[PDB]
Amino acid sequence: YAVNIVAALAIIIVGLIIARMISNAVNRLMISRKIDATVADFLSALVRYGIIAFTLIAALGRVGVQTASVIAVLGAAGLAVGLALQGSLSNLAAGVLLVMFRPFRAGEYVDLGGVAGTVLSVQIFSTTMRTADGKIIVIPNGKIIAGNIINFSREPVRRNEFIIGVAYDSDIDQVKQILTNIIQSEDRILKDREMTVRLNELGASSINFVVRVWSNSGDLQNVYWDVLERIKREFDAAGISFPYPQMDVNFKRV
Amino acid sequence: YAVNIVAALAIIIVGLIIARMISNAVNRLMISRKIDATVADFLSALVRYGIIAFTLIAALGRVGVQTASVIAVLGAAGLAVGLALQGSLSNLAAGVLLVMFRPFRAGEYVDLGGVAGTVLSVQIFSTTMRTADGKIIVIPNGKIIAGNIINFSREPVRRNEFIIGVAYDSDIDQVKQILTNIIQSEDRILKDREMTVRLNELGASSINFVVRVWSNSGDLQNVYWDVLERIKREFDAAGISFPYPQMDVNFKRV
Amino acid sequence: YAVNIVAALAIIIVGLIIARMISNAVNRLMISRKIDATVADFLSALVRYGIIAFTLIAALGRVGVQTASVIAVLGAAGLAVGLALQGSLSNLAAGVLLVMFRPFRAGEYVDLGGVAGTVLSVQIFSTTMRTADGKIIVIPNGKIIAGNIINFSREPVRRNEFIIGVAYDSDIDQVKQILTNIIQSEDRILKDREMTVRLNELGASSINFVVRVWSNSGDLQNVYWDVLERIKREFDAAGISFPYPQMDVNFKRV
Amino acid sequence: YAVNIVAALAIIIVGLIIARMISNAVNRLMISRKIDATVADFLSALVRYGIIAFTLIAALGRVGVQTASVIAVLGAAGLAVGLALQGSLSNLAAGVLLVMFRPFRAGEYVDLGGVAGTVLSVQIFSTTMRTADGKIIVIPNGKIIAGNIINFSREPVRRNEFIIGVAYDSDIDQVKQILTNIIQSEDRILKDREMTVRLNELGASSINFVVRVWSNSGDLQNVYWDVLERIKREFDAAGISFPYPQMDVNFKRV
Amino acid sequence: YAVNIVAALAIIIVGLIIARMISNAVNRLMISRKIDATVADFLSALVRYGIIAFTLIAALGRVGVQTASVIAVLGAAGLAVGLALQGSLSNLAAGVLLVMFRPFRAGEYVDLGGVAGTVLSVQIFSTTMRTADGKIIVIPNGKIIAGNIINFSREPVRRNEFIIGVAYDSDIDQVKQILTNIIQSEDRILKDREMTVRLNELGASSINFVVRVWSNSGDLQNVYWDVLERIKREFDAAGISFPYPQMDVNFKRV
Amino acid sequence: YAVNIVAALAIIIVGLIIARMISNAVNRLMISRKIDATVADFLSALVRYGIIAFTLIAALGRVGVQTASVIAVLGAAGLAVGLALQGSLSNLAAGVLLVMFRPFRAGEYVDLGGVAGTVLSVQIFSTTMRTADGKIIVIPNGKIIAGNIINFSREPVRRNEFIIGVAYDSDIDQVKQILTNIIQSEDRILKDREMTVRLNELGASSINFVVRVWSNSGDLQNVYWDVLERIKREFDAAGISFPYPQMDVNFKRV
Amino acid sequence: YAVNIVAALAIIIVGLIIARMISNAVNRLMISRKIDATVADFLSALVRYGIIAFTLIAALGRVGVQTASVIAVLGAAGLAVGLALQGSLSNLAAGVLLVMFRPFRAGEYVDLGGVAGTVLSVQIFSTTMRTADGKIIVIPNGKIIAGNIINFSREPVRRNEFIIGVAYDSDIDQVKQILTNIIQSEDRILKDREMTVRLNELGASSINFVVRVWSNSGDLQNVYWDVLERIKREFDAAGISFPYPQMDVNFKRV
C-alpha cells in the first residue's frame, strides 16, 4: 500500500530529473544545430511539460487511481498535435520522396504548378528556385508533389509554335513557301524532326498559319526570336500583310 | 521484484543492438537500392529513434511503471506520420491501381486532366509523359486517378469538327455542295461513318457550318489541315466569302 | 518460463512458413487474375512483411515483453495505408453503388460532370465512355458519384431551343407566323407537347425570339439542323433580316 | 492446453460453416433484391473473407497467441472501408434527412445548386429530376444537402423583372406611363403586390427602367413573354426607341 | 462452463426481445412524428440489426471466444456512420448555434453568402428564406455558419452610392452644385450623416462623380430611384450630358 | 452473483436520478446564459440521453456486454458528434486566438478576406462588423483566422495611387511639373515620405502617369478626391487632354 | 468495500482542490501574460471542468463501476476539441517551422501567395507585414507554409521586362538600335548579365519588342521608370510611333 506511494514518488523524482535533462539537452541540441533560442525554449518547455505529464500520469497509475481519463485526453491532445503537424510532416514526407525519386536536380529548369524557375536547392521542407526574372520562390514540397512537375531540362529538344496571322487575300502557297524557306535556312532548327507549316485556322480578321519547329532546349528562345524577326522581314519584303483587326461597316443614313 | 530488474536492462540492451543493426541494414539496403546517403541516414535515424523508443517503453513497462501515456502519444505520433504520408502513400496506391487496371500503357497519347502527352513510363509514384511540344511532365498518380483519363490511343478512329463561318448572303446549298465535295474527295476520311455538313449556327457577323468528319487517329490532324486548306482554296475560287466582323453603323451628323 | 520461449519460436516458425505460403498464394492469384508480376511481387513482399511483422509482435508478446508500442505504431501504419487507400476504395464503393443503383448502363449516352459520351462499360473502378468525337474517357467512379449524372438516354423525348435574332424593324407577328409554320410543318416535332414561339429578349443589336420545340431523343439534332436551315431559308425569302452588330455613331469632328 | 486447441478448431469449423451459410444467404438476399450476380459475388466474397478473418483471429486468440496486431490492422482496414464509404453513406444519411425533412416532393420544380428541374423521385441515394429541356439529372443527396435548395413550387406567387433599355432622349414620364398601362391592363399580374416601374440605371448607351411585377407561379413566364411583346409593340407605336449600342466618334486625320 | 453457455443464450433471448421492442417502438415514434414509413422501417431495421449485432457478439464473448476483432470492425463501422453523418450533424450543430447566437431572426432580410432574402424560419437543419423575387431557398445551417451573414435589418440606416458619369466638358462645380441640391432637397436622406458629392474617377469615355448618401433602411431603394430620376431630370434640364462611349478615330483612308 | 444484480440496479437508480438532476441543471444554466427554452430542452434531452446511456451501459456491463461493444460504438457516435463540433468549435478556438492575440479587437477598420468594415465587436464565435455602406456582416472566427487580416487602423499613414492617362502628344515634363505642383501644394500629403510622379505605362490609347502619395489614414480619401479634382482642373486649364479610347481606322473599298 | 468508497471520496476532495488551484493558477498565469480576463475565465472554467471530469471518472472507477463509456465519450470530446484546434495548432507548427527554416526575416520584402509586403515581424501564430501602399496584413502561418514564398530580398539582382508596342511600319533595326542605346547608356543596368532587345510578338494592332534588363533590387523600379520615360522621349524624337488600336474598315454603304 505505502510501497506504491513511495514507488510513485520515486517515479515522480526520476521523471522530473529526466524532464529537466531532456529539456536542457534539446535546448543545447537546437542551439548547436539551429540558431533560435526563444522557440527552442518554447519547444523545450513543451517537451518538459510532456515528460512531467507522462510521469504524473504514471505516478497516479502507480498509486491505484484508474487513469484512463487523462490517457484518452492526452491521446486526443497528441492527435491534435498530429492533425496540426499533418501539413508540415507532409512537406517532410514529400521532401524525402522528392529527393529519393528526384524529378528535378539542383539546376534543372522546371515549372512547379504555375511558377517556373531553375531549382537552386531541394531542401527537406521546401525547394528554393530562382525565377527567370530574379525572384526567389520557396515552394513547399507538398505543393510540389501534389501537382505536376513540368521539367524543361530532361529532354534536350523542344518545340516552338509560331502562329502567323496573314490576310485572307494572301496566297496560301506563297506563305507556305516563305515560311518553309525561313525554317529550312535556319541552322538551329532540327530538320530530322517535325517541321510543320500548314494552315491552322480561318481566323476572324486574319488567317492563321502554324509553324511547329523543333530545336535544342538551349537554342529554343533564340530560334523563336530569330525566326519571328525573319518572318516579319521576309513577309514585309514579299508583300504579305499582317492584317489589323478588320471590320465590315454597313453605313446607314438616318 | 528483482526479476523485473536487470532482465529489463536485458530487454533494453537486446533492443539497442537490434536498433543499430536495423539502422545499418536499411542504410546498406537503400545504398543498394536508391543512393542518396544524406536523407538515407535521416530515415535510418528515424528508424533508430523508433526502435529505441519501442524498447525504452517496453523496458519501463517491464519494470512496473504503467505505460499508457507514451503509448497513446506514440500512437498519435504514428498517426501524425500516417496523415502526413497520406498523399505519398495515396500516390503509391493509385500507382499500383494504375498499373494493374492500366488505362494507359507506356506510349499511349493521353490527356490527364489538362495536360496531354505520350506516356513514357508509369512508375510507382508518378507517370512521366512527354507533351506534344517537348516538355516532360511528371504527374503524380493520385492526381491521375482523382481525375479523368482521356485516352487517344485506344480508339483508332476519331472526329474532326470544322466550323466554317461564311457570309449571310452565301447560298446554303452551294456551301453544302462544296463542303461535301471536299469531304468526299478526301481519301483519309472514313466514308462509312458520320459525314455531317449542316448549318450549325446563325452567328453574329457570319453563319457557321459544322463539318463533322471521322478519320483515323494518326491521320486526324492531317485531315484537319488538308480539308481546311482545301476549304479556303475552293471557297475563294467559288466566290463564297469568309466575312470579317460586321458592324451596321447608323451615322448621325450632330 | 522457457516454455514461453519455445512457444515463441514455434509461433516464429509457423509464421515464417505462413508468410511464405500466403505470399506464394497471392502471387498465384495475381498472376491468374489481374495479370502482373512486378507490382504483384511488390504487394506480395508487402504481405510477407506484414505477416512477419504480426508474428514478430506475437512472439515478443509470448516471450513476455509488453508490446503495445509496436501495436499502436502498426495500427497507425495500417491507418496510414487506409487513409491512403481512401480514394481507391471510395472508387470501389462508388462502383458497386453505381452498378447496383445503375443510373446508366453500357450504351446510355450520359454527361458525367463536364464530359459527355456513351458509356462503353462500367467496370469496378471506372466507367469507360466514348465521347461524341471519338475520345475514350475513363472516369473514376468516385468522381461520377460525387457529381451529377445527366442521362440523355432515359427520356425518349427532349427539347431543342432556338434563339433567332431578328432586326428591331421586323414585324413580331410575321416572325411568329413564319416560325410557327416552320415548327408545324416539320414532322419529327412532337405536336402534343409545348411548341413555344414567343418574344424572348429585347437584345442590344437584335431582338431574340425563342423557339422551344420537343422532339424525339434520336431525332433531336436533326430537328435542330433542319429547322435552323429552314429558318434561314424562309426568313431570307420573306425579307426578315438577321442583323449584324449594330452601332449608332454620333460623329462630331473633334 | 489441448482443450484450447480443440476449442480453437471448434471455433474454426463453426466459423467456416457460418461464413459459407451467411455468404449463401447474402447471395440470396441480394439476387432477390438487386439482380446483378457479379458484384453480389464480390461482396459475398468480401463478407466471407471478413468472417473467416474474424474466426482465424478468434482461433489464434483461443490458442493463446496475443492477437492484437491483426486486430489493430483489421480495425484500421475497417477504417479504410469506412473512410472509403464516407461519400456513399453520406449520400444515404442525406437521403433519409432529405426525405424526413422534405424541402421538395416528387413533382416539385426546384433548383438544386445549379441545375434546375422537376423532381421525379427522391430515392435513397439520389434524386432523379427532369430538366425543363428533357434531360434526366440524377443528383446525389450529399450534393443536395451540402448546397442550396431553391424551391419554386412552395410559394404560389413569384416576380418577373423586366429591364427595358430606352434612349436617353426618351421622356421618363411617358415611358413610366406606358409601362404602367401595360402592367395594369394585364390581368395575370397581381395588383395587390408591388408593381414597380422606376428608373433603375443610367446605362452606357441606354437608360434602364426596371419593371418588377408579381404574378402566379404558373403564369410567370407567360406574363414575362406577353408583357415583353406588349412593351415592344406599344413602345414602337408610341415612338420610344430601344437604342443600339451608341458611340460618340471624334473624327481626325492621318 | 455450461453456465456460460446458458448465460449466453439468456443474453441472446433478452437481446432479441429488446431488439424487437426497440425496433418497433422506434418505428412507432417515427410514424407518429415522421409520417414517412418507407425510411422509418429502414432506420428501425438498422437499429434492430445493430442491437442484434451487439447482443450476438456479447454472447460470443460470454461463451469465451475472444471477440475483440468484430469489436474493432464494428467500431470502425460506427466511425463510418460517423464520418457519413458529419455533414448532417454539422448542420444540426450549426443550427443550434445559429438559434442560440442568433444573427438573424425570422423576418430579418439577410444575405447568407450569395443568396439574399428574408428569413422565413430557422429550423433545426436549415433556414428557409424567401428571396426578393419570390423564390424559396432552403439553406443548410453549415453553409450559413461557414460563411458570412450580411444582415440588412440590424442597422436602421444604410448608404446609397450613385455613380454618375458626365462628360469631360462638363463643369465640375456645376455638377457638384446640382447633385448637392438634389441630395439636400430630398427629405428621406439623413442630413446628419455623410453626404459625399465628389469626383470619384476619370473614366475612359466619361468622368464619374460619386454620391454617397445615407438614408433609412426601408427608404433606401426609393431614395436611390428618386434621386436617380431627379439626377436624370435636372441634368437634362441644366445641359449636363451623360456621355455615350467615346472613340477618337484617326482616318487613314488608304 | 446477485450482489452484482442489486449493485447494477443501484447504478441504474442513481444514474436515473443523476440524469434528471444534471439535465435540470443544464436547462437552468442554459435558460440563464444562452436563453432559448426549446433548444435548451433539446440539449438537456441529449444530455439526459447521454447520462442514461452511460449508466445503462455501466450497469449492464457487469451482467453483460463483455469489454466494450456498445462502448466501441458509442465512442464512434461520440466522434460523430465530434466532427460536427470540430466544424463548429473551430470558430471558438479561433475566437480565443483572436482575443488573446488581438489583431483588430478595438474597433479598427479592417478587411477580413474580401469584406471590409469597422469591427463592432469580437464575440466568442463571430466578429460583427459594420461595412462602409451600412451593412452588418457577422463573420465567423474560423473564416477570419483561415484568411488574411488587412488592418487599416494599425498604421497611421497610408498611400494613395493615382493613375492619370494623358495623351501621347502630352509633354512628359509638363505633366510631371503640374502633378508635382498639385502634390506639393496639398498640405495633407506627407512630404517626408515617398512622393512619386513618374511615367508608369505606355497605354493602348493613353499614357499612364502614376502618382504615389503618402498621407494620414484619416485624410486619405479626401486627399484622393481633392488631388483628383485638382488634377482634372489644372490639366484642363493647361491644355493637357485626358484622351478617349483612340482607334486608328484604315478605310478600304467595298 | 468501504475502503474503496472512502478512497473515492479522497480522490474527489483532492481533485476538487487541485481543480480550484489549477484554475486559479492559470488565471494568474494568463493575467500575467495576456491580460484579457474575460476569456481567461472561460479557459479556466474549461480546465476546471476538465479536472473535475477526470476526478469524477476516477472516483467512479475507484468505486467499482465500469467506466469505459465516459472514457470513450471523453476521448471523442477531446478529439472534438483537437480537430477544432487543428487550424490554430497548424498555424503554431507552421510558425515554429517558419522561424526555424526562415525563408524571410523581419524586413525582407516578400510575396506570400497574393499579397506582397515587407515582413514587419514573424510572430508565433502569424506574420505581420506592411504592404507597399501602407496596409498592415496579418497573415496566418499555415496560409504562408501552404503556399509559395516569393522572396524579393534574397537575390540582389532582378529583371525588368519592358514590352514596347511599335507600329508595323517601323523599322526593326532602328527600334533595336534605339532600345540598345537606351539600355546601354543607362548606368544602373547590369551589363554583365542578359540584355535582351528582340522582337517578341507580332501583335494585333502593334508589334511588341521585349526588353529584358537586369539591375539591382533597389534600383529596379527606378530603372523601369527611367528607361520607359527615355523610350517614350527618344522614340518620339526618332519618329517611331506607338500605335493606337488599329481597325481596318471596309465601307459597304448598303
Short mmCIF file of N, CA and C in Angstrom, two decimals, chain A residues 34-36 39 42 64-66 68-70 72-73 76 79-80 83-86 88 91 115 124-125 130 132-140 143 224-226 228-229 232-233 242-251, chain G residues 54 57-58 62 71 78-79 82-83 86 89-90 92-93 96-97 99-102 145-152 155 159 168 172-173 176 196 198-200 202 204-205 207 210 212 214 246-252 254:
data_model
loop_
_atom_site.label_atom_id
_atom_site.label_comp_id
_atom_site.label_asym_id
_atom_site.label_seq_id
_atom_site.Cartn_x
_atom_site.Cartn_y
_atom_site.Cartn_z
N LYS A 34 20.29 24.53 -34.77
CA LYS A 34 19.59 25.71 -35.25
C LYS A 34 20.21 26.96 -34.61
N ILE A 35 19.53 28.10 -34.73
CA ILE A 35 20.10 29.36 -34.28
C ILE A 35 19.24 29.96 -33.17
N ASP A 36 17.93 29.69 -33.19
CA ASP A 36 17.00 30.39 -32.32
C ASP A 36 17.04 29.80 -30.92
N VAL A 39 12.09 30.05 -29.53
CA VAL A 39 11.22 28.95 -29.89
C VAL A 39 11.87 27.63 -29.52
N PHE A 42 10.73 27.37 -26.11
CA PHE A 42 9.31 27.07 -26.17
C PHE A 42 9.06 25.58 -26.42
N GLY A 64 -2.89 3.78 -7.74
CA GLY A 64 -4.03 2.90 -7.86
C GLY A 64 -5.24 3.59 -8.46
N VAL A 65 -5.07 4.86 -8.82
CA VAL A 65 -6.16 5.61 -9.42
C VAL A 65 -6.29 5.20 -10.88
N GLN A 66 -7.51 4.84 -11.28
CA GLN A 66 -7.80 4.46 -12.67
C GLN A 66 -7.63 5.70 -13.54
N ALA A 68 -7.43 6.25 -17.00
CA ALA A 68 -7.73 6.22 -18.43
C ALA A 68 -8.32 7.53 -18.95
N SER A 69 -8.78 8.42 -18.08
CA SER A 69 -9.37 9.69 -18.49
C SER A 69 -8.31 10.60 -19.09
N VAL A 70 -7.26 10.85 -18.32
CA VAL A 70 -6.13 11.62 -18.82
C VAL A 70 -5.37 10.87 -19.91
N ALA A 72 -6.97 9.11 -22.34
CA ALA A 72 -7.76 9.42 -23.52
C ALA A 72 -7.62 10.88 -23.94
N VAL A 73 -7.57 11.80 -22.97
CA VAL A 73 -7.47 13.21 -23.31
C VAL A 73 -6.05 13.55 -23.77
N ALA A 76 -5.84 12.24 -27.31
CA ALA A 76 -6.50 13.16 -28.22
C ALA A 76 -5.74 14.48 -28.36
N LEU A 79 -3.05 13.61 -30.70
CA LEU A 79 -3.68 13.54 -32.01
C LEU A 79 -4.04 14.91 -32.55
N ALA A 80 -4.30 15.88 -31.67
CA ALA A 80 -4.44 17.27 -32.08
C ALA A 80 -3.14 17.81 -32.65
N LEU A 83 -2.73 16.01 -36.16
CA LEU A 83 -3.50 16.62 -37.24
C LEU A 83 -3.13 18.07 -37.47
N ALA A 84 -2.46 18.71 -36.51
CA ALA A 84 -1.84 20.00 -36.75
C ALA A 84 -0.63 19.86 -37.66
N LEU A 85 0.32 19.03 -37.25
CA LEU A 85 1.57 18.81 -37.97
C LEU A 85 1.40 18.00 -39.24
N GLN A 86 0.17 17.62 -39.61
CA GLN A 86 -0.14 16.99 -40.89
C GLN A 86 0.48 17.70 -42.08
N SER A 88 3.03 20.06 -42.15
CA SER A 88 4.49 20.18 -42.11
C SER A 88 5.17 18.83 -42.29
N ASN A 91 4.96 17.90 -45.84
CA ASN A 91 6.05 18.53 -46.58
C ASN A 91 7.35 17.77 -46.38
N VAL A 115 4.50 28.39 -61.31
CA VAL A 115 5.75 29.13 -61.20
C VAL A 115 6.83 28.29 -61.85
N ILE A 124 14.85 19.95 -47.20
CA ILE A 124 14.00 18.92 -46.64
C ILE A 124 12.53 19.35 -46.65
N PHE A 125 12.24 20.62 -46.40
CA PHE A 125 10.87 21.09 -46.32
C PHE A 125 10.42 21.92 -47.51
N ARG A 130 15.02 29.86 -58.40
CA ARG A 130 15.14 31.21 -58.90
C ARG A 130 14.35 31.33 -60.19
N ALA A 132 12.84 33.18 -63.74
CA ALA A 132 13.54 33.74 -64.89
C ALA A 132 13.80 35.23 -64.72
N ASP A 133 13.04 35.91 -63.86
CA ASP A 133 13.21 37.33 -63.64
C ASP A 133 13.76 37.65 -62.26
N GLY A 134 14.54 36.75 -61.67
CA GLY A 134 15.32 37.04 -60.50
C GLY A 134 14.65 36.74 -59.17
N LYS A 135 13.34 36.53 -59.16
CA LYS A 135 12.63 36.28 -57.91
C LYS A 135 12.97 34.90 -57.36
N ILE A 136 13.11 34.81 -56.05
CA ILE A 136 13.39 33.55 -55.37
C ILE A 136 12.09 33.03 -54.79
N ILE A 137 11.64 31.88 -55.26
CA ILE A 137 10.38 31.28 -54.82
C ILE A 137 10.72 30.05 -54.01
N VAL A 138 10.20 29.98 -52.79
CA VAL A 138 10.47 28.89 -51.87
C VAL A 138 9.20 28.05 -51.80
N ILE A 139 9.12 27.01 -52.63
CA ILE A 139 7.90 26.23 -52.74
C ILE A 139 7.96 25.07 -51.75
N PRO A 140 6.94 24.87 -50.92
CA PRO A 140 6.93 23.69 -50.05
C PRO A 140 6.76 22.41 -50.86
N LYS A 143 3.19 20.97 -51.90
CA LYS A 143 2.61 21.67 -53.04
C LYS A 143 3.26 21.26 -54.35
N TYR A 224 13.04 31.05 -81.68
CA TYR A 224 11.76 31.76 -81.75
C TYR A 224 11.95 33.21 -82.17
N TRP A 225 12.90 33.91 -81.54
CA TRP A 225 13.09 35.32 -81.82
C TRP A 225 13.66 35.55 -83.22
N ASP A 226 14.60 34.70 -83.65
CA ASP A 226 15.20 34.86 -84.96
C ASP A 226 14.23 34.52 -86.08
N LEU A 228 10.98 34.63 -85.84
CA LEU A 228 9.90 35.62 -85.83
C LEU A 228 10.32 36.92 -86.50
N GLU A 229 11.53 37.40 -86.20
CA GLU A 229 12.04 38.61 -86.85
C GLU A 229 12.25 38.37 -88.34
N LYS A 232 8.82 38.48 -90.04
CA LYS A 232 8.39 39.87 -90.24
C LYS A 232 9.14 40.52 -91.39
N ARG A 233 10.46 40.29 -91.48
CA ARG A 233 11.26 40.90 -92.55
C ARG A 233 10.90 40.35 -93.92
N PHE A 242 0.48 41.35 -92.60
CA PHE A 242 -0.13 41.02 -91.33
C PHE A 242 -1.30 41.96 -91.11
N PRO A 243 -2.53 41.48 -91.09
CA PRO A 243 -3.67 42.38 -91.08
C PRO A 243 -4.00 42.89 -89.69
N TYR A 244 -4.57 44.08 -89.67
CA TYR A 244 -5.13 44.66 -88.48
C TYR A 244 -6.48 43.99 -88.20
N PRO A 245 -7.08 44.23 -87.04
CA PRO A 245 -8.47 43.82 -86.85
C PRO A 245 -9.39 44.45 -87.88
N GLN A 246 -10.11 43.60 -88.59
CA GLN A 246 -10.89 44.01 -89.74
C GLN A 246 -12.35 44.15 -89.36
N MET A 247 -12.98 45.18 -89.90
CA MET A 247 -14.40 45.39 -89.73
C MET A 247 -15.02 45.63 -91.09
N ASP A 248 -16.18 45.05 -91.32
CA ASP A 248 -17.02 45.46 -92.42
C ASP A 248 -18.15 46.32 -91.88
N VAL A 249 -18.25 47.52 -92.40
CA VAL A 249 -19.14 48.52 -91.84
C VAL A 249 -20.23 48.82 -92.85
N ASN A 250 -21.48 48.66 -92.44
CA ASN A 250 -22.64 48.87 -93.30
C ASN A 250 -23.23 50.21 -92.89
N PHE A 251 -22.81 51.28 -93.55
CA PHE A 251 -23.28 52.61 -93.18
C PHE A 251 -24.75 52.80 -93.55
N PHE G 54 -12.15 14.51 -14.92
CA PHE G 54 -11.14 13.47 -14.71
C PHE G 54 -11.29 12.82 -13.35
N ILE G 57 -14.59 10.71 -13.02
CA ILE G 57 -14.44 9.41 -13.67
C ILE G 57 -13.51 8.51 -12.87
N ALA G 58 -12.45 9.08 -12.30
CA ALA G 58 -11.52 8.29 -11.48
C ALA G 58 -12.19 7.80 -10.20
N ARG G 62 -12.86 4.03 -9.05
CA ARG G 62 -12.38 3.51 -7.77
C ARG G 62 -13.50 2.90 -6.95
N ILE G 71 -15.17 7.18 -20.70
CA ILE G 71 -13.80 7.28 -21.21
C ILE G 71 -13.82 7.46 -22.72
N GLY G 78 -12.38 15.08 -26.44
CA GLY G 78 -11.03 15.57 -26.61
C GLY G 78 -10.60 15.62 -28.06
N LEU G 79 -11.01 14.64 -28.85
CA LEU G 79 -10.75 14.68 -30.28
C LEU G 79 -11.60 15.73 -30.99
N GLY G 82 -9.65 18.76 -30.27
CA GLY G 82 -8.43 18.66 -31.04
C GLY G 82 -8.58 18.95 -32.52
N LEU G 83 -9.56 18.33 -33.17
CA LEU G 83 -9.81 18.64 -34.57
C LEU G 83 -10.43 20.02 -34.75
N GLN G 86 -7.23 22.09 -34.74
CA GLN G 86 -6.38 21.73 -35.86
C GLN G 86 -5.80 22.92 -36.62
N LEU G 89 -3.40 25.11 -34.07
CA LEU G 89 -2.13 24.45 -33.83
C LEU G 89 -1.36 24.18 -35.11
N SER G 90 -2.03 24.14 -36.27
CA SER G 90 -1.29 24.09 -37.53
C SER G 90 -0.61 25.42 -37.81
N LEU G 92 0.46 27.29 -35.40
CA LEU G 92 1.57 27.24 -34.44
C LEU G 92 2.75 26.45 -34.99
N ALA G 93 2.48 25.26 -35.54
CA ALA G 93 3.54 24.42 -36.08
C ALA G 93 4.17 25.05 -37.31
N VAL G 96 6.60 27.83 -35.92
CA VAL G 96 7.91 27.38 -35.46
C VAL G 96 8.72 26.83 -36.63
N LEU G 97 8.05 26.27 -37.64
CA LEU G 97 8.73 25.85 -38.86
C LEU G 97 9.25 27.03 -39.66
N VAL G 99 10.09 29.90 -38.47
CA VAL G 99 11.15 30.61 -37.77
C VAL G 99 12.39 29.73 -37.56
N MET G 100 12.29 28.41 -37.75
CA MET G 100 13.49 27.58 -37.73
C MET G 100 14.02 27.27 -39.12
N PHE G 101 13.26 27.54 -40.17
CA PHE G 101 13.67 27.29 -41.55
C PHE G 101 13.60 28.57 -42.37
N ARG G 102 13.82 29.72 -41.73
CA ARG G 102 13.24 31.02 -42.09
C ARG G 102 13.54 31.47 -43.52
N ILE G 145 2.92 28.75 -45.14
CA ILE G 145 3.52 27.46 -45.44
C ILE G 145 2.76 26.70 -46.51
N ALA G 146 1.44 26.85 -46.59
CA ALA G 146 0.67 26.11 -47.58
C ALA G 146 0.79 26.69 -48.99
N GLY G 147 1.46 27.82 -49.15
CA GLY G 147 1.65 28.41 -50.47
C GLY G 147 3.09 28.78 -50.74
N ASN G 148 3.35 29.40 -51.89
CA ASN G 148 4.71 29.79 -52.22
C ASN G 148 5.13 31.02 -51.43
N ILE G 149 6.44 31.21 -51.33
CA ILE G 149 7.03 32.36 -50.64
C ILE G 149 7.97 33.00 -51.65
N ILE G 150 7.50 34.03 -52.34
CA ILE G 150 8.27 34.71 -53.38
C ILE G 150 9.05 35.82 -52.69
N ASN G 151 10.33 35.57 -52.43
CA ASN G 151 11.16 36.48 -51.67
C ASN G 151 11.92 37.39 -52.63
N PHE G 152 11.72 38.70 -52.48
CA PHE G 152 12.38 39.67 -53.35
C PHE G 152 13.67 40.21 -52.76
N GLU G 155 17.76 37.74 -53.51
CA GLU G 155 18.77 37.96 -54.52
C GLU G 155 18.91 39.45 -54.81
N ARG G 159 15.08 41.58 -62.64
CA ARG G 159 14.96 41.79 -64.07
C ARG G 159 13.70 42.57 -64.39
N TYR G 168 3.66 48.61 -87.17
CA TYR G 168 4.15 47.60 -88.10
C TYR G 168 5.06 48.20 -89.16
N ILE G 172 12.65 47.47 -87.87
CA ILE G 172 13.03 46.62 -86.74
C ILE G 172 14.43 46.97 -86.25
N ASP G 173 15.34 47.26 -87.18
CA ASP G 173 16.73 47.52 -86.81
C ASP G 173 16.88 48.87 -86.13
N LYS G 176 15.60 48.35 -82.56
CA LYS G 176 16.59 47.62 -81.78
C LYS G 176 17.82 48.47 -81.49
N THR G 196 18.54 41.69 -73.32
CA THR G 196 17.79 41.23 -74.48
C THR G 196 16.98 42.38 -75.04
N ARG G 198 14.78 42.15 -78.41
CA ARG G 198 14.44 41.32 -79.56
C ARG G 198 12.94 41.38 -79.79
N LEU G 199 12.54 41.03 -81.01
CA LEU G 199 11.15 41.12 -81.46
C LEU G 199 10.35 40.01 -80.82
N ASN G 200 9.48 40.37 -79.88
CA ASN G 200 8.82 39.34 -79.08
C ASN G 200 7.55 38.84 -79.75
N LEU G 202 4.18 39.58 -82.79
CA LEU G 202 3.50 40.32 -83.86
C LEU G 202 2.06 40.51 -83.44
N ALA G 204 -1.76 42.44 -82.62
CA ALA G 204 -2.92 42.70 -83.47
C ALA G 204 -2.82 44.06 -84.13
N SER G 205 -2.65 45.11 -83.34
CA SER G 205 -2.52 46.46 -83.85
C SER G 205 -1.09 46.98 -83.82
N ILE G 207 3.36 45.87 -82.83
CA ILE G 207 4.33 44.79 -82.87
C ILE G 207 5.25 44.99 -81.67
N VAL G 210 10.47 43.09 -76.82
CA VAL G 210 10.73 42.80 -75.42
C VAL G 210 12.11 43.33 -75.08
N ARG G 212 14.45 42.80 -71.91
CA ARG G 212 14.73 42.15 -70.64
C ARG G 212 16.07 42.66 -70.14
N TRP G 214 18.64 43.33 -66.61
CA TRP G 214 18.94 43.01 -65.23
C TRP G 214 19.52 44.22 -64.53
N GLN G 246 -5.77 49.55 -83.92
CA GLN G 246 -5.95 49.73 -85.34
C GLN G 246 -7.10 48.88 -85.84
N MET G 247 -7.99 49.51 -86.60
CA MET G 247 -9.05 48.80 -87.29
C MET G 247 -8.90 49.04 -88.78
N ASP G 248 -9.14 48.01 -89.57
CA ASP G 248 -9.36 48.18 -90.99
C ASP G 248 -10.84 48.10 -91.28
N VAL G 249 -11.36 49.17 -91.87
CA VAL G 249 -12.80 49.32 -92.06
C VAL G 249 -13.09 49.22 -93.55
N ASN G 250 -13.99 48.31 -93.91
CA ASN G 250 -14.44 48.13 -95.29
C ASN G 250 -15.83 48.74 -95.39
N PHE G 251 -15.93 49.88 -96.07
CA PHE G 251 -17.21 50.53 -96.32
C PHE G 251 -18.08 49.66 -97.21
N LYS G 252 -19.28 49.32 -96.75
CA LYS G 252 -20.21 48.62 -97.64
C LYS G 252 -21.29 49.57 -98.13
N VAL G 254 -24.37 50.12 -97.73
CA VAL G 254 -25.64 49.46 -98.13
C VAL G 254 -26.19 49.80 -99.52
#
